[PDB]
Design a protein around this nucleic acid. Structure first.
Ligand SMILES: O=C(O)CNC(=O)C(=O)O
Ligand SMILES: [Fe+2]
Ligand SMILES: [Zn+2]
Ligand SMILES: [Zn+2]
Ligand SMILES: [Zn+2]
Length: 407
DNA sequence: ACCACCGGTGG
DNA sequence: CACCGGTGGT
């Protein structure tokens, strides 16, 4: 209840002040002090974008040291003094899965998806004018998104598998059952590993996604009781333009596991290239977690908060909209950088890291790669989610069979 | 409003 | 190659 600004929700969760969040996260993660970093971010509502307008970052929150284990972005709600005055927006576990696992997933998923992977077009693959080339213009190499598990379907108002006699949640090109089983095993195993981390760090969101686990098990991933996830998307060097995951269930979240190219697996030192995760409607604070101006200035000079970097680069523009050859034009971010209130708070997720955010409510995006290449990607993101209305047994078979019966 | 959306099956 | 039809967002 409230009687006292951006989307309001508390399932990640929330408290009367920044200090309360620290207690909450210290309790959840188990460690105290340095291990947990909290950045205050400010919702401006003014979207950061290039002149074209594709995703851009204005600030990059980077892991400060090996000591930093948990990053939490918090939004202090303008004018509130209640028990949910400050809410958690993003949680990032730098050391999310074992590094040997992360190395092995990188290789295996890249190899499997490049040869047997089947494309999944998405509106967020393109800018508003549907004329950009953020993915790269080589069909064999361009960044791409692949969708697996279950997903919601307007045609059934439920799982897309409502008619499927034994559906293939991990359909690869053509036929090969053995390749699909191998891909299934990796992502099933990873789903299984990630659930307890999700329970631990975002229990309220985890609990919501678990409610109907026993009613619709056919629409859940994972091999062990506690199955919050329904679908997985693999994004290889994919530039996701600013969007919200509107199909996701209410009061849940998305877990994003990041895998990086081999030149970007050591703490510190720059790889080139690098893909960023962006909240285009936020700016960073004047002040650090505990309210010190000097402290936040130190982070800026040390690079824990990297202040970008207005650019003027050259890029491709398609002569005709994709609509569901090209010319060079130069892209600019001068205007987003002129306005202190135009947002673009980004994080640089590491190899093996796990990012938690309410992707349904928060506008978000990933930056385009300099030279996208899905066959040897700079970044692979593994995005775990549950869509709305995935609460019926057997992929909603009964419902549709019954709805068509009355006709 | 109203355009435009992380597919599948039978034929 | 053609039916099935929910709903946020500028
Ligand atoms: O790649 C991640 O950081 C973000 N992924 C998405 O926003 C998505 O595919 O819906
Ligand atoms: Fe998304
Ligand atoms: Zn673009
Ligand atoms: Zn309040
Ligand atoms: Zn299903």
């Amino acid at each position: 209840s409230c009687r006292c600004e951006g989307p309001f929700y508390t399932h990640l969760g929330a408290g009367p002040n920044v200090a309360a969040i620290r207690e909450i996260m210290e309790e959840r993660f188990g460690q105290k002090g340095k291990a947990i970093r909290i950045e205050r971010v400010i919702y401006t509502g003014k979207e950061g974008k290039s002149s074209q307008g594709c995703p851009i970052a204005k600030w990059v929150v980077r892991r400060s040291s090996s000591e930093e284990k948990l990053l939490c972005l918090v939004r202090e709600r303008a004018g509130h003094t209640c028990e949910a005055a400050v809410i958690v927006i993003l949680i990032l576990v730098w050391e999310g899965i074992p590094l040997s696992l992360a190395d092995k997933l990188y290789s295996e998923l890249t190899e499997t998806l490049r040869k047997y992977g089947t494309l999944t077009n998405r509106r967020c693959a393109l800018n508003e004018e549907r004329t950009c080339a953020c993915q790269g213009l080589d069909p064999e190499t361009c960044g791409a998104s692949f969708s697996f598990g279950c997903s919601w379907s307007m045609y059934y108002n439920g799982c897309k598998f409502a008619r499927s006699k034994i559906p293939r949640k991990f359909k690869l090109l053509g036929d090969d059952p053995k390749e699909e089983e191998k891909l299934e095993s990796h992502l099933q195993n990873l789903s299984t590993l990630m659930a307890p981390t999700y329970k631990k760090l975002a229990p309220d969101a985890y609990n919501n996604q678990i409610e109907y686990e026993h009613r619709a098990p056919e629409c859940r991933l994972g091999l062990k009781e506690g199955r919050p996830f329904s679908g997985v998307t693999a994004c290889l060097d994919f530039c996701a333009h600013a969007h919200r995951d509107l199909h996701n269930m209410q009061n849940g979240s998305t877990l994003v596991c990041t895998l990086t190219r081999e030149d970007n697996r050591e703490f510190g030192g720059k790889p080139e290239d690098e893909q960023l995760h962006v909240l285009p409607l936020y700016k960073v604070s004047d002040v650090d977690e505990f309210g010190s101006v000097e402290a936040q200035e130190e982070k800026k000079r040390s690079g824990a908060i990297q202040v970008l970097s207005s650019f003027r680069r050259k890029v491709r523009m398609l002569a005709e909209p994709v609509k569901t050859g090209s010319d060079e034009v130069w892209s600019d971010s001068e205007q987003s950088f002129l306005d202190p209130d135009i947002g673009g708070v980004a994080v640089a997720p590491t190899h093996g890291s796990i990012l938690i955010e309410c992707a349904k409510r928060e506008l978000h995006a990933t930056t385009p790669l300099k030279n996208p290449n899905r066959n040897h990607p700079t970044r692979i993101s593994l995005v775990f989610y549950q869509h709305k209305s995935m609460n019926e047994p057997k992929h909603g078979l009964a419902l549709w069979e019954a709805k068509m019966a009355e006709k």
